[PDB]
Amino acid sequence: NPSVEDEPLLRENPRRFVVFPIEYHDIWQMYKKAEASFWTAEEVDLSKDIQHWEALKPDERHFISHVLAFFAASDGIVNENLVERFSQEVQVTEARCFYGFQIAMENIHSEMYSLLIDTYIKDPKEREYLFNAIETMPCVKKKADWALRWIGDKEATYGERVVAFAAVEGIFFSGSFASIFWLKKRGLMPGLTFSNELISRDEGLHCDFACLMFKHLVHKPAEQRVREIITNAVRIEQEFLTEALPVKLIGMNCTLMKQYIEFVADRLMLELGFNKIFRVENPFDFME
Amino acid sequence: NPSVEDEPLLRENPRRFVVFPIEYHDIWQMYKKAEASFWTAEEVDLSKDIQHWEALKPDERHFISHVLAFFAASDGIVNENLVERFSQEVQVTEARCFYGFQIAMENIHSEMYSLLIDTYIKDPKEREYLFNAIETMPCVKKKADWALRWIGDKEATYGERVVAFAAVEGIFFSGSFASIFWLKKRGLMPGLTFSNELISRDEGLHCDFACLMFKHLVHKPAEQRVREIITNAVRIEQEFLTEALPVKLIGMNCTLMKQYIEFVADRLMLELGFNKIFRVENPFDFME
Numbered sequence: 001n002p003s004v005e006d007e008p009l010l011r012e013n014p015r016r017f018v019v020f021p022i023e024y025h026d027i028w029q030m031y032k033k034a035e036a037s038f039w040t041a042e043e044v045d046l047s048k049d050i051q052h053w054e055a056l057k058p059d060e061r062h063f064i065s066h067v068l069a070f071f072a073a074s075d076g077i078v079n080e081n082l083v084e085r086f087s088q089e090v091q092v093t094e095a096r097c098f099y100g101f102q103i104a105m106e107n108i109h110s111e112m113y114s115l116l117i118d119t120y121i122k123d124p125k126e127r128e129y130l131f132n133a134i135e136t137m138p139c140v141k142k143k144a145d146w147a148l149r150w151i152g153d154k155e156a157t158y159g160e161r162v163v164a165f166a167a168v169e170g171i172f173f174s175g176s177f178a179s180i181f182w183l184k185k186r187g188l189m190p191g192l193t194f195s196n197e198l199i200s201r202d203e204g205l206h207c208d209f210a211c212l213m214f215k216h217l218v219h220k221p222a223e224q225r226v227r228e229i230i231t232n233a234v235r236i237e238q239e240f241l242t243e244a245l246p247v248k249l250i251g252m253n254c255t256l257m258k259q260y261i262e263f264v265a266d267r268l269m270l271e272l273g274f275n276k277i278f279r280v281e282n283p284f285d286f287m288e
Numbered sequence: 289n290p291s292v293e294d295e296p297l298l299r300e301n302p303r304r305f306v307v308f309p310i311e312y313h314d315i316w317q318m319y320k321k322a323e324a325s326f327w328t329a330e331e332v333d334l335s336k337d338i339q340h341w342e343a344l345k346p347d348e349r350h351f352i353s354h355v356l357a358f359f360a361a362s363d364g365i366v367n368e369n370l371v372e373r374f375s376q377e378v379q380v381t382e383a384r385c386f387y388g389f390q391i392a393m394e395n396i397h398s399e400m401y402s403l404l405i406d407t408y409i410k411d412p413k414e415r416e417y418l419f420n421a422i423e424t425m426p427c428v429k430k431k432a433d434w435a436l437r438w439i440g441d442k443e444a445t446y447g448e449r450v451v452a453f454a455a456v457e458g459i460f461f462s463g464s465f466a467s468i469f470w471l472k473k474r475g476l477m478p479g480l481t482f483s484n485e486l487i488s489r490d491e492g493l494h495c496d497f498a499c500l501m502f503k504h505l506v507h508k509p510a511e512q513r514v515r516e517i518i519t520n521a522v523r524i525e526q527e528f529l530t531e532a533l534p535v536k537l538i539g540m541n542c543t544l545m546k547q548y549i550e551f552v553a554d555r556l557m558l559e560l561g562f563n564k565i566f567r568v569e570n571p572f573d574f575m576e
């Protein structure tokens with residue numbers, strides 16, 4: 001390999017397989033924060049929610065079910081990206097650790113969503129419909145396809161793929177994470193919202209890490225390119241939350257939801273070392 | 289792909305990425321046992337050992353240091369096998385889960401050994417010597433090379449590679465796990481032996497799982513082939529523990545150590561569904 005041979009993160013250097021002669025304390029500290037946040041789905045008590053789900057309005061259940069549909073496999077995709085690309089291509093021991101843990105936690109998120117979906121939708125029909133939302137519901141498909149693309153895209157560089165996946169884990173999740181936090185505020189679905197809390201704290205960590213990898217990348221995509229992969233994520237996430245599945249359904253103001261998504265992308269841009277794109281304030285007090 | 293298209297474990301079937309429509313409860317139960325056994329190195333208290341290491345005899349420290357040398361990277365190799373082969377080639381959600389966890393736990397074992405090595409060898413010279421034992425100490429190299437081979441071996445089949453790695457995780461570790469348990473018995477090195485307890489319980493689980501994968505493999509290697517990959521592991525592990533690093537050094541009877549290694553391989557053969565090879569009793573009461 002050429003250009004790669006000059007990238008600390010990817011260079012075939014290791015000639016080691018050991019951990020303590022610690023090379024990057026920043027990457028290491030990130031792996032430690034994650035190890036510290038370990039949790040199992042068994043910990044989220046879903047016993048009640050089954051009826052909480054009943055107390056809901058039809059438009060709300062519609063909403064929450066479509067949102068779950070998406071979360072049902074995305075953390076699937078992620079782990080399929082991390083095991084056949086990142087945790088691989090990267091040869092820095094501290095980063096492979098962070099990545100080994102991320103994969104373990106994505107399979108737990110993945111499990112969490114399923115339990116959710118099983119606890120709420122008992123009629124088998126719907127259940128299968130939601131489980132295979134990747135191939136049944138357009139909107140989510142137009143999402144899963146995006147993250148699914150950077151996996152097999154044989155052309156994109158690790159620089160571009162890290163950003164894109166940061167967009168998937170932060171922008172593609174921010175929409176729903178915000179709306180789920182809304183419910184919590186409004187006193188609804190404590191099993192949903194509690195799980196949504198643990199998981200969100202993980203995705204936050206998975207993005208900062210992605211950003212951190214980006215910053216250890218030498219030859220990275222130009223700002224304009226990054227701005228465009230992020231911007232596109234914003235549009236696909238917006239369209240999703242104020243069109244194919246309007247947050248109106250749970251009583252939220254689309255226009256503000258949009259502004260939030262942008263505020264999120266702005267925070268992602270800072271993290272990556274660039275300027276804000278949209279320059280808009282985070283409109284939800286319970287999010288800032 | 290041909291033959292593979294007919295293997296449940298490897299067939300490009302998924303078209304899912306979700307976990308709850310649970311297909312194999314046996315593989316699932318194995319992933320749950322593992323999730324349940326989670327532990328962090330932070331949990332092993334090494335505060336004392338530094339001097340316990342001093343109370344030891346020179347031949348014993350020699351022994352324990354060379355044994356650590358090996359454990360310093362093997363769990364490195366394993367995870368490099370699991371991320372760029374098994375967790376990949378396998379498409380069964382329950383198995384990828386077990387594998388996501390195994391990788392997370394191997395990076396912790398990997399960390400555990402380093403902490404050990406740092407706590408015991410303070411002089412930097414030795415320390416680097418042991419950390420790079422893969423390229424410094426023959427005997428271990430003749431071990432790491434074996435597991436390292438089935439990783440890049442482009443010819444071997446997933447059937448053969450599962451057995452071989454089961455040989456690496458059970459036979460290549462049994463020797464040292466036995467001798468470390470000896471010390472525990474004889475009142476020595478509680479930090480070493482305690483960590484050696486947690487880790488051993490994991491490798492046991494990693495082998496049964498490997499065996500379990502083998503049993504879900506349709507078209508597998510013939511018994512003779514399996515007998516030979518296992519037998520070879522026995523010889524390389526024996527030679528190591530009664531030649532290049534005789535258990536004599538910690539007061540153990542080589543001849544019996546050999547018999548143990550065979551008893552271990554026999555238990556591995558049963559597990560895989562075959563007949564015992566050696567037919568010898570497990571000689572250590574504290575192991576059977």
Ligand SMILES: [Co+2]
Binds near residue numbers: 075105106199
């Ligand atoms: Co996740």
Ligand SMILES: [Co+2]
Binds near residue numbers: 078203
């Ligand atoms: Co994530």
Ligand SMILES: [Co+2]
Binds near residue numbers: 393394397490
């Ligand atoms: Co291990």
Ligand SMILES: [Co+2]
Binds near residue numbers: 491
């Ligand atoms: Co193992």
